[PDB]
Coordinates of C-alpha atoms in Angstrom, one line a residue:
Chain A
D741 CA 0.0 0.0 0.0
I742 CA 1.2 3.5 -0.8
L743 CA 2.1 5.5 2.3
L744 CA 1.5 9.3 2.1
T745 CA 3.6 11.4 4.4
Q746 CA 2.5 14.9 5.4
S747 CA 5.0 16.8 7.3
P748 CA 5.0 19.0 9.3
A749 CA 1.7 18.2 11.0
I750 CA 1.1 21.9 11.9
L751 CA 1.9 24.9 9.8
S752 CA 1.9 28.5 11.4
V753 CA 1.7 31.4 9.0
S754 CA 0.8 35.1 9.3
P755 CA -2.3 36.6 7.6
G756 CA -1.9 37.1 3.9
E757 CA 1.4 35.1 3.7
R758 CA 2.0 32.2 1.2
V759 CA 1.9 28.7 2.7
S760 CA 2.8 25.3 1.3
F761 CA 1.7 21.8 2.5
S762 CA 3.9 18.8 1.7
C763 CA 2.8 15.4 0.6
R764 CA 5.3 12.6 0.0
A765 CA 4.4 9.2 -1.5
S766 CA 6.4 6.1 -0.6
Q767 CA 6.7 5.4 -4.4
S768 CA 6.1 7.2 -7.6
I769 CA 2.4 7.8 -8.3
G770 CA 2.6 10.1 -11.3
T771 CA 0.1 13.0 -10.7
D772 CA -2.6 10.9 -9.1
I773 CA -2.9 12.9 -5.9
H774 CA -5.9 14.9 -4.7
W775 CA -6.2 17.3 -1.8
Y776 CA -9.0 17.8 0.7
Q777 CA -9.9 20.5 3.2
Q778 CA -11.6 19.6 6.5
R779 CA -12.8 22.4 8.7
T780 CA -13.8 21.8 12.4
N781 CA -16.9 19.6 12.4
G782 CA -17.1 19.5 8.6
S783 CA -16.7 16.8 6.1
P784 CA -13.7 16.8 3.6
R785 CA -14.0 18.9 0.5
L786 CA -12.1 18.4 -2.7
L787 CA -9.7 21.3 -3.4
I788 CA -7.4 20.0 -6.1
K789 CA -7.4 16.9 -8.2
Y790 CA -4.6 15.1 -10.1
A791 CA -2.0 17.2 -8.2
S792 CA -2.7 20.6 -10.0
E793 CA -6.2 20.8 -11.4
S794 CA -8.5 23.5 -10.3
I795 CA -12.0 22.6 -8.9
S796 CA -14.7 25.1 -9.7
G797 CA -16.0 26.8 -6.6
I798 CA -12.5 26.8 -5.0
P799 CA -10.7 30.2 -4.6
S800 CA -8.0 30.9 -7.1
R801 CA -5.8 31.3 -4.0
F802 CA -5.3 27.5 -3.9
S803 CA -2.9 25.7 -6.2
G804 CA -1.1 22.4 -6.5
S805 CA 2.1 21.2 -8.0
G806 CA 4.3 18.1 -8.1
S807 CA 4.7 14.7 -9.7
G808 CA 6.3 11.4 -8.9
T809 CA 6.7 11.3 -5.1
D810 CA 6.7 15.0 -3.9
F811 CA 3.6 17.1 -4.0
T812 CA 2.7 20.5 -2.7
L813 CA -0.6 22.3 -1.9
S814 CA -0.1 26.1 -1.8
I815 CA -2.2 29.0 -0.6
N816 CA -1.0 32.4 -1.9
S817 CA -2.2 34.8 0.8
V818 CA -3.8 32.9 3.6
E819 CA -6.9 34.1 5.3
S820 CA -8.9 32.9 8.3
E821 CA -11.3 30.7 6.4
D822 CA -8.3 28.6 5.3
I823 CA -8.0 27.4 9.0
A824 CA -8.6 23.7 8.6
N825 CA -6.9 20.3 8.2
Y826 CA -5.6 19.4 4.8
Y827 CA -5.4 15.8 3.5
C828 CA -3.8 14.4 0.4
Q829 CA -5.0 11.1 -1.2
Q830 CA -3.5 8.9 -3.9
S831 CA -5.4 6.9 -6.6
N832 CA -2.5 5.6 -8.5
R833 CA -2.6 2.1 -6.9
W834 CA -5.2 0.1 -5.1
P835 CA -6.3 0.7 -2.3
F836 CA -6.7 4.5 -2.3
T837 CA -4.9 5.9 0.8
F838 CA -4.9 9.3 2.6
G839 CA -2.1 11.2 4.2
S840 CA -2.3 11.9 8.0
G841 CA -3.1 15.6 7.4
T842 CA -1.6 19.0 8.2
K843 CA -3.3 21.7 10.2
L844 CA -3.1 25.4 9.1
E845 CA -2.7 27.8 12.0
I846 CA -2.7 31.6 11.6
Chain B
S1220 CA -21.8 -3.3 -50.2
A1221 CA -19.6 -6.4 -50.5
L1222 CA -19.2 -8.9 -47.6
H1223 CA -15.5 -8.1 -46.8
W1224 CA -16.4 -4.4 -46.2
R1225 CA -19.5 -5.0 -44.1
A1226 CA -17.4 -7.4 -42.0
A1227 CA -14.6 -4.9 -41.6
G1228 CA -17.1 -2.3 -40.5
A1229 CA -18.8 -4.8 -38.2
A1230 CA -15.4 -5.8 -36.8
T1231 CA -14.5 -2.2 -36.1
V1232 CA -17.7 -1.4 -34.3
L1233 CA -17.4 -4.7 -32.3
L1234 CA -13.8 -3.7 -31.3
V1235 CA -15.0 -0.4 -30.0
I1236 CA -17.6 -2.2 -27.9
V1237 CA -14.9 -4.6 -26.6
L1238 CA -12.6 -1.7 -25.8
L1239 CA -15.4 0.0 -23.8
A1240 CA -16.5 -3.2 -22.0
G1241 CA -12.9 -4.2 -21.4
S1242 CA -12.1 -0.9 -19.8
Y1243 CA -15.1 -1.2 -17.6
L1244 CA -14.6 -4.9 -16.6
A1245 CA -10.8 -4.4 -16.1
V1246 CA -11.4 -1.8 -13.4
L1247 CA -14.0 -4.1 -11.9
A1248 CA -11.5 -7.0 -11.8
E1249 CA -8.5 -5.1 -10.7
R1250 CA -9.9 -3.0 -7.8
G1251 CA -9.3 -5.1 -4.7
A1252 CA -5.9 -6.3 -5.7
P1253 CA -3.2 -4.5 -3.7
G1254 CA -0.7 -2.8 -6.1
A1255 CA -3.0 -2.8 -9.1
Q1256 CA -2.8 0.3 -11.4
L1257 CA -5.6 -0.6 -13.9
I1258 CA -8.2 0.9 -11.6
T1259 CA -9.8 4.0 -13.0
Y1260 CA -11.9 4.2 -16.2
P1261 CA -10.0 6.8 -18.4
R1262 CA -6.7 5.0 -18.3
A1263 CA -8.2 1.5 -18.5
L1264 CA -9.6 2.7 -21.8
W1265 CA -6.2 3.8 -22.9
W1266 CA -4.9 0.4 -21.7
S1267 CA -7.5 -1.5 -23.7
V1268 CA -6.5 0.4 -26.9
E1269 CA -2.7 -0.3 -26.4
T1270 CA -3.6 -3.9 -25.6
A1271 CA -5.9 -4.4 -28.6
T1272 CA -3.2 -3.0 -30.9
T1273 CA -0.7 -5.3 -29.2
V1274 CA 1.6 -2.3 -28.3
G1275 CA 1.7 -3.1 -24.6
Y1276 CA 4.0 -0.3 -23.3
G1277 CA 4.0 -1.7 -19.8
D1278 CA 2.7 1.5 -18.1
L1279 CA -0.5 -0.4 -17.2
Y1280 CA -1.4 -4.1 -17.1
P1281 CA -3.8 -6.3 -15.2
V1282 CA -2.6 -8.4 -12.3
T1283 CA -5.7 -10.4 -11.3
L1284 CA -7.0 -13.5 -13.0
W1285 CA -10.2 -11.9 -14.3
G1286 CA -8.4 -8.8 -15.4
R1287 CA -6.0 -11.0 -17.3
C1288 CA -9.0 -12.9 -18.8
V1289 CA -10.5 -9.5 -19.9
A1290 CA -7.1 -8.7 -21.4
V1291 CA -7.0 -11.8 -23.5
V1292 CA -10.4 -11.2 -25.0
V1293 CA -9.2 -7.6 -25.8
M1294 CA -6.1 -8.9 -27.4
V1295 CA -7.9 -11.5 -29.5
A1296 CA -10.6 -9.0 -30.5
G1297 CA -7.9 -6.6 -31.6
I1298 CA -5.7 -9.0 -33.5
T1299 CA -8.8 -10.5 -35.1
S1300 CA -10.3 -7.1 -36.1
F1301 CA -7.1 -5.9 -37.7
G1302 CA -6.5 -9.2 -39.4
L1303 CA -10.0 -9.0 -40.8
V1304 CA -9.3 -5.6 -42.2
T1305 CA -6.1 -7.0 -43.8
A1306 CA -8.1 -9.8 -45.3
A1307 CA -10.6 -7.3 -46.7
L1308 CA -7.8 -5.3 -48.3
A1309 CA -6.5 -8.6 -49.8
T1310 CA -9.9 -9.3 -51.4
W1311 CA -10.1 -5.8 -52.9
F1312 CA -6.7 -6.1 -54.4
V1313 CA -7.3 -9.6 -55.7
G1314 CA -10.6 -8.6 -57.3
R1315 CA -9.0 -5.5 -58.9
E1316 CA -6.2 -7.7 -60.2
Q1317 CA -8.7 -10.1 -61.8
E1318 CA -10.3 -7.2 -63.7
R1319 CA -7.0 -5.7 -64.8
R1320 CA -6.2 -9.1 -66.2
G1321 CA -9.5 -9.6 -67.9
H1322 CA -10.4 -12.7 -65.9
Chain C
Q108 CA 24.3 38.1 -34.9
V109 CA 22.4 38.5 -31.6
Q110 CA 19.7 35.8 -31.8
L111 CA 17.3 37.0 -29.0
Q112 CA 16.8 40.7 -28.1
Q113 CA 15.2 41.8 -24.8
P114 CA 14.9 45.3 -23.3
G115 CA 17.4 46.0 -20.5
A116 CA 14.9 47.1 -17.9
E117 CA 11.3 47.7 -16.9
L118 CA 10.2 49.4 -13.7
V119 CA 6.7 48.4 -12.5
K120 CA 4.7 50.0 -9.7
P121 CA 3.5 47.4 -7.1
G122 CA 0.4 45.6 -8.2
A123 CA 0.8 46.7 -11.8
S124 CA 1.7 44.5 -14.7
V125 CA 4.3 44.5 -17.6
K126 CA 4.7 42.8 -20.9
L127 CA 8.2 41.6 -21.5
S128 CA 9.4 41.1 -25.1
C129 CA 11.9 38.8 -26.9
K130 CA 12.6 39.3 -30.6
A131 CA 14.2 36.3 -32.3
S132 CA 16.5 36.4 -35.3
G133 CA 18.7 33.8 -36.9
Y134 CA 17.2 30.5 -37.9
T135 CA 13.5 30.0 -36.8
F136 CA 11.9 26.6 -37.2
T137 CA 8.3 25.5 -36.9
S138 CA 9.5 23.4 -34.0
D139 CA 11.3 26.1 -31.9
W140 CA 10.3 26.8 -28.3
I141 CA 10.9 30.1 -26.5
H142 CA 11.5 29.7 -22.8
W143 CA 11.4 32.2 -19.9
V144 CA 13.7 32.0 -16.9
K145 CA 13.6 34.2 -13.8
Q146 CA 16.7 35.0 -11.6
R147 CA 16.3 37.0 -8.4
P148 CA 19.3 38.8 -7.1
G149 CA 21.7 36.4 -5.4
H150 CA 19.6 33.4 -6.5
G151 CA 19.7 30.8 -9.2
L152 CA 17.8 30.1 -12.4
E153 CA 14.1 29.5 -12.2
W154 CA 12.2 28.0 -15.1
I155 CA 9.0 30.0 -15.7
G156 CA 7.4 28.8 -18.9
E157 CA 7.6 28.0 -22.6
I158 CA 5.7 28.8 -25.8
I159 CA 5.8 27.4 -29.3
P160 CA 5.2 30.4 -31.6
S161 CA 4.2 28.3 -34.7
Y162 CA 1.2 26.8 -32.8
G163 CA 0.9 29.3 -30.0
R164 CA 0.7 26.7 -27.2
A165 CA 2.2 27.6 -23.8
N166 CA 3.1 25.9 -20.6
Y167 CA 3.8 27.3 -17.2
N168 CA 5.7 26.3 -14.0
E169 CA 3.0 25.1 -11.6
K170 CA 5.2 25.1 -8.5
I171 CA 5.1 28.9 -8.5
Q172 CA 2.2 31.3 -8.4
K173 CA 1.0 32.1 -12.0
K174 CA 1.3 35.8 -12.7
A175 CA 2.6 35.2 -16.3
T176 CA 0.8 34.8 -19.6
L177 CA 2.7 33.9 -22.8
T178 CA 1.9 35.0 -26.4
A179 CA 3.8 35.2 -29.6
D180 CA 3.6 37.3 -32.8
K181 CA 4.6 35.0 -35.7
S182 CA 4.8 38.0 -37.9
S183 CA 7.3 39.9 -35.7
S184 CA 9.2 36.8 -34.5
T185 CA 8.6 38.3 -31.0
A186 CA 7.5 36.4 -27.9
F187 CA 5.8 38.2 -25.1
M188 CA 5.5 37.4 -21.4
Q189 CA 2.8 39.3 -19.4
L190 CA 3.6 39.3 -15.7
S191 CA 0.6 40.7 -13.9
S192 CA 0.0 42.0 -10.3
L193 CA 3.6 42.2 -9.3
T194 CA 5.2 42.4 -5.9
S195 CA 8.7 42.9 -4.6
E196 CA 9.0 39.1 -4.8
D197 CA 8.8 39.5 -8.6
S198 CA 11.7 41.8 -9.0
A199 CA 14.2 39.8 -11.0
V200 CA 16.2 39.4 -14.2
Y201 CA 14.0 37.6 -16.7
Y202 CA 15.8 35.8 -19.5
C203 CA 14.4 34.4 -22.7
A204 CA 16.0 31.4 -24.3
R205 CA 15.5 29.4 -27.5
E206 CA 15.3 25.6 -27.5
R207 CA 15.0 23.6 -30.7
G208 CA 12.7 21.1 -29.0
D209 CA 15.7 18.9 -28.2
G210 CA 15.9 20.0 -24.5
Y211 CA 18.7 22.5 -24.0
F212 CA 18.9 26.3 -24.3
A213 CA 21.4 26.9 -27.0
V214 CA 21.1 30.7 -27.0
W215 CA 19.9 33.2 -24.4
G216 CA 18.7 36.8 -24.3
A217 CA 20.6 39.4 -22.3
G218 CA 17.6 39.5 -19.9
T219 CA 15.3 42.3 -18.6
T220 CA 15.8 43.7 -15.2
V221 CA 12.3 44.1 -13.8
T222 CA 12.1 46.3 -10.6
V223 CA 8.9 46.6 -8.6
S224 CA 8.7 49.8 -6.6
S225 CA 6.8 53.1 -6.3
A226 CA 9.9 55.3 -6.9
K227 CA 10.4 57.4 -10.1
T228 CA 12.9 56.8 -12.8
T229 CA 16.1 58.9 -12.4
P230 CA 18.9 59.0 -15.0
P231 CA 22.3 58.8 -13.4
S232 CA 24.9 61.6 -13.1
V233 CA 28.3 60.7 -14.5
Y234 CA 31.5 62.3 -13.1
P235 CA 35.1 62.0 -14.1
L236 CA 37.7 60.4 -11.7
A237 CA 41.2 61.6 -12.7
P238 CA 44.0 61.6 -10.1
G239 CA 44.9 64.5 -7.9
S240 CA 48.0 66.3 -9.2
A241 CA 50.2 65.4 -6.2
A242 CA 49.6 61.7 -7.0
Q243 CA 52.7 59.8 -8.3
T244 CA 52.5 57.9 -11.6
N245 CA 53.6 54.3 -12.0
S246 CA 54.0 52.5 -15.3
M247 CA 50.2 52.2 -15.2
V248 CA 47.6 54.9 -14.4
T249 CA 44.1 54.4 -13.0
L250 CA 41.1 56.4 -14.1
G251 CA 37.4 56.1 -13.3
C252 CA 33.9 57.5 -13.4
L253 CA 31.1 57.8 -10.9
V254 CA 27.5 56.8 -11.7
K255 CA 25.3 58.2 -8.9
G256 CA 21.7 59.0 -8.1
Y257 CA 20.0 56.7 -10.6
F258 CA 17.0 54.4 -10.4
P259 CA 16.2 51.7 -11.2
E260 CA 18.9 49.2 -11.9
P261 CA 20.8 48.6 -14.1
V262 CA 23.4 50.8 -15.8
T263 CA 25.9 49.6 -18.4
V264 CA 29.4 51.1 -18.3
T265 CA 31.9 50.7 -21.1
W266 CA 35.2 52.4 -21.8
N267 CA 35.9 54.0 -25.2
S268 CA 32.7 52.5 -26.4
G269 CA 33.7 48.9 -25.8
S270 CA 37.3 49.1 -27.2
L271 CA 38.8 49.2 -23.7
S272 CA 38.1 45.9 -21.8
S273 CA 41.3 44.9 -20.2
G274 CA 41.9 46.8 -17.0
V275 CA 38.2 47.4 -16.2
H276 CA 36.3 47.0 -12.9
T277 CA 32.7 48.1 -12.4
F278 CA 31.5 47.9 -8.8
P279 CA 28.1 46.7 -7.8
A280 CA 25.7 49.5 -7.1
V281 CA 24.7 50.5 -3.5
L282 CA 21.3 51.9 -2.7
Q283 CA 21.0 55.1 -0.7
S284 CA 17.7 57.1 -0.2
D285 CA 16.0 55.4 -3.3
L286 CA 19.0 56.2 -5.6
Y287 CA 21.8 53.9 -6.8
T288 CA 25.5 54.7 -6.9
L289 CA 28.4 52.8 -8.4
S290 CA 31.8 53.6 -9.8
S291 CA 33.8 52.1 -12.6
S292 CA 37.6 51.8 -12.8
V293 CA 40.0 51.6 -15.8
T294 CA 43.8 51.1 -16.0
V295 CA 45.8 52.0 -19.0
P296 CA 49.6 52.5 -19.5
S297 CA 50.7 55.8 -17.9
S298 CA 52.3 56.4 -21.3
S299 CA 48.9 56.1 -23.0
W300 CA 47.0 58.9 -21.2
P301 CA 46.0 61.6 -21.7
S302 CA 47.9 61.4 -25.0
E303 CA 45.3 59.0 -26.2
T304 CA 41.7 59.6 -25.1
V305 CA 39.8 57.7 -22.4
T306 CA 36.0 58.0 -22.2
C307 CA 33.4 56.2 -20.1
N308 CA 30.0 55.4 -21.7
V309 CA 27.0 55.0 -19.3
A310 CA 23.7 53.7 -20.6
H311 CA 20.7 53.6 -18.3
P312 CA 18.0 51.6 -20.1
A313 CA 15.1 52.4 -17.8
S314 CA 15.5 56.1 -18.7
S315 CA 16.7 55.6 -22.3
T316 CA 19.8 57.6 -21.4
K317 CA 23.4 57.2 -22.7
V318 CA 26.2 59.6 -21.8
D319 CA 29.9 59.9 -22.6
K320 CA 32.5 61.4 -20.3
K321 CA 36.1 62.0 -21.3
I322 CA 38.6 61.6 -18.5
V323 CA 41.1 64.5 -18.8
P324 CA 43.7 65.5 -16.2
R325 CA 42.6 68.2 -13.7
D326 CA 43.2 71.8 -14.6
Chain D
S353 CA 1.9 -0.4 -62.1
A354 CA -0.9 -2.5 -60.4
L355 CA -3.2 -1.2 -57.7
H356 CA -1.9 -3.2 -54.8
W357 CA 1.6 -1.9 -55.4
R358 CA 0.6 1.8 -55.8
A359 CA -1.4 1.4 -52.6
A360 CA 1.6 -0.2 -50.7
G361 CA 3.7 2.7 -51.9
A362 CA 1.0 5.2 -50.9
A363 CA 0.6 3.5 -47.5
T364 CA 4.4 3.7 -46.8
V365 CA 4.6 7.4 -47.7
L366 CA 1.5 8.1 -45.7
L367 CA 3.0 6.3 -42.7
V368 CA 6.2 8.4 -42.8
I369 CA 4.0 11.5 -42.8
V370 CA 2.0 10.1 -39.8
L371 CA 5.3 9.3 -38.0
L372 CA 6.5 12.8 -38.5
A373 CA 3.3 14.6 -37.6
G374 CA 2.8 12.2 -34.7
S375 CA 6.3 13.0 -33.3
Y376 CA 5.5 16.7 -33.6
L377 CA 2.0 16.5 -32.1
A378 CA 3.0 14.1 -29.3
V379 CA 5.6 16.6 -28.0
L380 CA 3.0 19.3 -28.3
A381 CA 0.5 17.3 -26.3
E382 CA 2.8 16.0 -23.6
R383 CA 4.7 19.1 -22.7
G384 CA 2.8 20.6 -19.7
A385 CA 2.1 17.2 -18.1
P386 CA 4.4 16.8 -15.1
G387 CA 6.4 13.6 -15.3
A388 CA 6.0 13.2 -19.1
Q389 CA 9.0 11.9 -21.1
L390 CA 7.6 12.2 -24.6
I391 CA 8.7 15.8 -24.8
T392 CA 11.6 16.3 -27.3
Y393 CA 11.4 15.7 -31.1
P394 CA 14.2 13.2 -31.8
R395 CA 13.0 10.6 -29.2
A396 CA 9.3 11.3 -30.0
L397 CA 10.2 10.2 -33.6
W398 CA 11.7 7.0 -32.3
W399 CA 8.6 6.6 -30.1
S400 CA 6.3 7.0 -33.1
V401 CA 8.3 4.3 -35.0
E402 CA 8.2 1.7 -32.1
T403 CA 4.5 2.5 -31.7
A404 CA 3.6 2.2 -35.4
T405 CA 5.4 -1.2 -35.5
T406 CA 3.5 -2.2 -32.2
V407 CA 6.8 -3.0 -30.5
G408 CA 6.1 -0.6 -27.5
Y409 CA 9.2 -1.1 -25.4
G410 CA 8.0 1.1 -22.6
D411 CA 11.0 3.5 -22.6
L412 CA 8.6 6.2 -23.8
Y413 CA 4.8 6.6 -23.9
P414 CA 2.2 9.4 -23.8
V415 CA 0.4 10.2 -20.5
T416 CA -1.9 13.0 -21.7
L417 CA -5.3 12.5 -23.4
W418 CA -4.2 14.1 -26.7
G419 CA -0.9 12.3 -26.7
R420 CA -2.8 9.1 -26.3
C421 CA -5.1 10.1 -29.1
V422 CA -2.0 10.9 -31.3
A423 CA -0.7 7.4 -30.3
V424 CA -3.8 5.7 -31.4
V425 CA -3.7 7.2 -34.9
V426 CA -0.1 6.2 -35.1
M427 CA -0.9 2.6 -34.1
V428 CA -3.7 2.4 -36.6
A429 CA -1.7 3.9 -39.4
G430 CA 1.1 1.5 -38.6
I431 CA -1.0 -1.7 -38.4
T432 CA -3.0 -0.7 -41.4
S433 CA 0.1 0.1 -43.5
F434 CA 1.8 -3.2 -42.7
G435 CA -1.5 -5.1 -43.3
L436 CA -1.8 -3.4 -46.6
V437 CA 1.7 -4.6 -47.6
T438 CA 0.7 -8.1 -46.5
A439 CA -2.4 -7.9 -48.6
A440 CA -0.3 -6.8 -51.6
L441 CA 2.0 -9.7 -51.2
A442 CA -1.0 -12.0 -51.1
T443 CA -2.2 -10.5 -54.4
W444 CA 1.1 -11.0 -56.0
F445 CA 1.3 -14.7 -54.9
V446 CA -2.3 -15.4 -55.9
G447 CA -1.8 -14.0 -59.4
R448 CA 1.5 -15.9 -59.8
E449 CA -0.2 -19.1 -58.7
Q450 CA -3.0 -18.6 -61.2
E451 CA -0.5 -18.3 -64.1
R452 CA 1.5 -21.3 -62.8
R453 CA -1.8 -23.2 -63.0
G454 CA -2.8 -21.9 -66.4
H455 CA -6.0 -20.2 -65.1
Chain E
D273 CA 9.4 17.4 -10.7
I274 CA 13.0 16.4 -10.9
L275 CA 15.2 18.0 -8.2
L276 CA 18.8 18.6 -9.3
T277 CA 21.3 18.8 -6.4
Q278 CA 24.6 20.7 -6.8
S279 CA 26.9 20.3 -3.9
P280 CA 29.1 21.8 -2.7
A281 CA 27.8 25.4 -3.5
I282 CA 31.4 26.8 -3.7
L283 CA 34.5 25.1 -5.1
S284 CA 38.0 26.5 -4.3
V285 CA 40.8 25.3 -6.5
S286 CA 44.4 26.6 -7.4
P287 CA 45.3 27.9 -10.8
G288 CA 45.8 25.1 -13.3
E289 CA 44.3 22.4 -11.1
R290 CA 41.5 20.0 -12.2
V291 CA 38.1 20.7 -10.8
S292 CA 34.8 18.7 -10.9
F293 CA 31.3 20.0 -10.3
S294 CA 28.6 17.5 -9.1
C295 CA 25.0 17.3 -10.2
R296 CA 22.6 14.7 -8.7
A297 CA 19.1 14.1 -10.0
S298 CA 16.4 12.9 -7.7
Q299 CA 15.6 10.1 -10.2
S300 CA 17.3 8.5 -13.2
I301 CA 17.3 10.9 -16.2
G302 CA 19.6 9.0 -18.6
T303 CA 22.0 11.5 -20.1
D304 CA 19.5 14.4 -20.4
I305 CA 21.6 16.9 -18.5
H306 CA 23.1 20.1 -19.8
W307 CA 25.5 22.5 -18.2
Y308 CA 25.6 26.3 -18.2
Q309 CA 28.2 28.9 -17.2
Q310 CA 27.1 32.3 -15.8
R311 CA 29.7 34.9 -15.2
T312 CA 29.1 38.1 -13.1
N313 CA 26.4 40.2 -14.9
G314 CA 26.1 37.7 -17.8
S315 CA 23.5 35.5 -19.1
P316 CA 23.9 31.6 -19.0
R317 CA 25.9 30.0 -21.7
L318 CA 25.6 26.4 -22.8
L319 CA 28.9 24.4 -22.1
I320 CA 27.9 20.8 -22.4
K321 CA 24.8 19.1 -23.7
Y322 CA 23.4 15.6 -23.0
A323 CA 25.9 15.1 -20.2
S324 CA 29.1 14.8 -22.3
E325 CA 28.7 16.4 -25.7
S326 CA 31.1 19.2 -26.7
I327 CA 29.7 22.6 -27.8
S328 CA 31.8 24.3 -30.5
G329 CA 33.3 27.5 -29.2
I330 CA 33.9 26.0 -25.8
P331 CA 37.5 25.3 -24.7
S332 CA 38.5 21.7 -24.8
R333 CA 39.3 22.2 -21.1
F334 CA 35.6 21.5 -20.3
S335 CA 34.2 18.0 -20.2
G336 CA 31.2 16.2 -18.9
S337 CA 30.5 12.7 -17.7
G338 CA 27.8 10.6 -16.0
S339 CA 24.4 9.0 -16.5
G340 CA 21.4 8.0 -14.5
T341 CA 21.5 10.2 -11.4
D342 CA 25.1 11.3 -11.0
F343 CA 26.7 13.9 -13.3
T344 CA 30.0 15.7 -13.4
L345 CA 31.3 18.8 -15.1
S346 CA 35.1 18.9 -15.2
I347 CA 37.7 21.6 -16.0
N348 CA 41.2 20.2 -16.6
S349 CA 43.5 23.1 -15.6
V350 CA 41.3 26.0 -14.3
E351 CA 42.1 29.5 -15.3
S352 CA 40.7 32.9 -14.2
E353 CA 38.1 33.1 -17.0
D354 CA 36.5 30.0 -15.5
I355 CA 35.4 32.1 -12.5
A356 CA 31.6 31.9 -12.7
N357 CA 28.5 30.0 -11.5
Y358 CA 27.8 26.7 -13.1
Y359 CA 24.3 25.3 -13.5
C360 CA 23.0 21.9 -14.6
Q361 CA 19.6 21.4 -16.2
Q362 CA 17.6 18.3 -17.0
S363 CA 15.3 17.7 -20.0
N364 CA 14.3 14.1 -19.4
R365 CA 10.9 14.9 -17.8
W366 CA 8.6 17.9 -17.9
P367 CA 9.1 20.5 -16.7
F368 CA 12.7 21.3 -17.3
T369 CA 14.5 22.1 -14.1
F370 CA 17.8 23.7 -13.0
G371 CA 20.2 22.9 -10.2
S372 CA 20.9 25.6 -7.7
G373 CA 24.4 26.2 -9.0
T374 CA 28.1 26.0 -7.9
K375 CA 30.5 28.9 -7.8
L376 CA 34.1 28.3 -8.9
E377 CA 36.7 30.2 -6.8
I378 CA 40.4 30.3 -7.5

């Protein structure tokens, strides 16, 4: 099974600063990584698919990059609503797996 | 419309249907096998094409028994379809060569 | 050759945008790609993006925020990069380069220094630097000129319009009150001056200024 | 010049043109996809050849939708061209065998 | 994306001595590495292509070797004009990337 490593677990940034979340796969998975946002008491919400593809309804602020084993989710200019946990998930090999998640803190 | 052309048309349609069902059944066979890559529909369709043509890059391939069975049908449908096109081109050339010889 | 031609400098107010140009000469093929590469002061080379002018298709670095937009004008053999909504983080030298679709950048532009600030353009002031008269002469003599009070970077300094190249130092500018200052140094045989003439040529692309200054002994 | 030979000649020319356009369009489809290897013209041409012949080593292959579409055209052009050559050889042998039998 | 590692960042050698710059790719890239020289205030200049291929106009002094993940640019007998930064760049996988560069110091 593909292990997804998200590190660090917490990320502290100042309002309006750029932030970058890291996802590392235990083996090459192409661009088959998707990113989810979970706010307090909420269910996950798709932000980015296939590493870098925009989802309509999602602020332009969010972007994704990477391929192979190293992946990044980026927020250019954080704001309060971005306070949540962020999970990556791979669909390259069965079974699908999730990373352990990174909290944004402002 | 001569037989060899109706059959080439029929073969081509039938191959497209095999490509589509094979994509769908491959994903259904391969999900549940740890390590399998043939597990989403878009790339399974690409996989069925490059199998039917016998290219077989190796980017994708089934690892389960039933995904391998689906693969065989796809290979045979593909080789048979292209061979039937070749045989139809043979018939066209052979007929044309009869006329050109006044036979 | 000069195969790619880029303007020396663009100053851009914060939040504004700018179109960078790159006019290609020499052999052009249907297959050629024009690439854009960013270099921030003291930092390395950063691949921004690429466009194929014959088909007009462009790709961008995903790993960095996307302020750019690439177009080409097949008629003018000119590729354009539109960087929009700039910040201090966008001040950099932007090179263009040509790749024949075989993976390496065979030829590069001289690059455009893009400065993001609110300050106004200011052409430099050029001043001679001839020795005092109580200075003793060796077999060589050292002259200079002083380029002060300009903005933005850069300025080009040559000596006798390029013909003098040995014996030349130009020092990095320093920044003081929103104006830049640098000096340039030249060393010629003592013999050879002022018998033969020595002139420094100072171009400041952001203000479309070029000036000459002859270095003559003091009165 | 009999039909089956003009067609084999035509097919071979047409394949060379497909190989060249496919090389060019593959690079244009694949650049911009992170991880893609089919992204410079010399090796794209080698890739089009080993696709047209259905060898498919796996050193190179498209990963985008439109590079996969370009790949299919290249596969079909290649299988069709070689099948048309086979059908022309069939026609030559069949004609020769008629004569040898006095038919 | 392929990360290119150039280490050390500075290389100090004595006049006329052999020097070797290191480039390491985060995954195998065959021989798809090219090397550039950037002098103070200059633009990059192609020195070597495809790991070991000579560029006309470039002193014989320069050579390149390597394949896979480990690559070397070598100067047999350094001289002052060789004082510059040296960058490697890969074209095996999209997007093209550069190494962070190594300065030669005499």
